[PDB]
Amino acid sequence: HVETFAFQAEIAQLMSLIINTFYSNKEIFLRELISNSSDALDKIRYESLTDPSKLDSGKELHINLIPNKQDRTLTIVDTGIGMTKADLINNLGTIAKSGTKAFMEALQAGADISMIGQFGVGFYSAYLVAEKVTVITKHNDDEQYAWESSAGGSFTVRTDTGEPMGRGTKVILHLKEDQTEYLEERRIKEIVKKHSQFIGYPITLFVE
């Protein structure tokens, strides 16, 4: 079964700002997702230092960037710590509430969209370029889930029956029709080089 959840008002509001504000420098979404993956990889690495078995679900600590013109998706895959059901439904919302408030405050003082990551809500920059985001995630202590939202005030969570991923998180960006440049190899390489060149994990850009 699919469960449907309301975003808290603040998140819905930040999602609408991101979708509605005129802002041409959309490419920043990518480094925010990469940065999130790098935090999650840092987290499982740290946890394995005292418990090597946290890596039984996979030892490779990496990020793949997967474009698919047929589906119109750009997928960011990591083998980081992953999110539990409790994360998806409760903790993210808690974290994202305070972070939205500070971000929205900062925008008044003429901060801009590109600083979203400093407030722990960079994930929502996905909506600069994606009409829909699907997040598939697997934590050691929990089942594989799929989160999804097209914004509009709600998100769904379900257990995922797709290919098991081991451990980690995939963020599938269903791109808007006018954002297919982010399916292009040279475009992705250009962005990664400019904003993400010093990440402490291998980034593989898949080709089609």
Interacting residue ranges for ligand PUZ, rule: CB under 6 A:
36-37, 40, 78, 80-83, 87, 91-92, 95-96, 120-121, 123, 135, 147, 169
CB of 170 to ligand PUZ, least distance (A): 9
Report CA torsion sign: 105, 107, 108, 111: positive
CB of 200 to ligand PUZ, least distance (A): 15
Check the annotation: does 69 bind a ligand: no
Query: Mind giving me the DSSP string for 142-205?
Result: S-EEEEEE-STTEEEEEE--SS--SSEEEEEEEE-GGGGGGG-HHHHHHHHHHH-TT-SS-EEE
Q: Rounded CA gap, 40 and 29, in Å?
A: 17
CB 199 within 8 A of CB 34: yes
**Helix/strand number for the chain, H first, E second:** 5, 8
Nearer to ligand PUZ, 29 or 147 (CB): 147
CB of 87 to ligand PUZ, least distance (A): 4
Nearer to ligand PUZ, 136 or 175 (CB): 136
CB 191 within 8 A of CB 32: no
Nearer to ligand PUZ, 27 or 78 (CB): 78
Check the annotation: does 78 bind a ligand: yes
Check the annotation: does 123 bind a ligand: yes
CB of 18 to ligand PUZ, least distance (A): 12
Tokens of 189: 């390489």
Q: At CA 107, angle to CA 104 and CA 109, rounded to 5? A: 130
Check the annotation: does 138 bind a ligand: no
Nearer to ligand PUZ, 95 or 205 (CB): 95
Binding residues: 36, 78, 97, 123
Binding residues for ATP: 36, 78, 97, 123
